């Protein structure tokens, strides 16, 4: 049960899908729907800048799963954030973990 914390070039990655995500979710309860991630992902990687690479099916469908933790069964941004991190990875992008020191 680890956050999402890595170098300063990734983590801008999330900002998008951060900034995006509120621009489906219509309820504006920070939820949004499964089905609408495959679509919200068409706009999601096109502001990351990623080209020629798209999220299969296949695979997020484990992502969710992956934060599909016991729930309504629902999904929302924080989790959706974790999500890009592995749909990034897929396409060749090494992410590490960072630290800063107090």
Not at 47 to 73: R, Y
Not at 75 to 80: A, D, F, R, T
């Amino acid at each position: 049960s680890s956050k999402p914390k890595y170098n300063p070039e990734v983590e801008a990655k999330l900002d998008v899908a951060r900034r995006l995500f509120k621009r489906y979710d219509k309820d504006g309860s920070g939820q949004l729907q499964d089905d609408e991630i495959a679509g919200l992902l068409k706009d999601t990687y096109a502001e990351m800048g990623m080209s020629n690479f798209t999220p299969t099916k296949e695979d997020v469908k484990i992502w969710l799963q992956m934060a599909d933790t016991n729930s309504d069964g629902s999904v929302s941004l924080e989790e959706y954030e974790d999500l890009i991190i592995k749909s990034l990875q897929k396409a060749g992008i090494r992410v590490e973990k960072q630290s800063l020191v107090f």
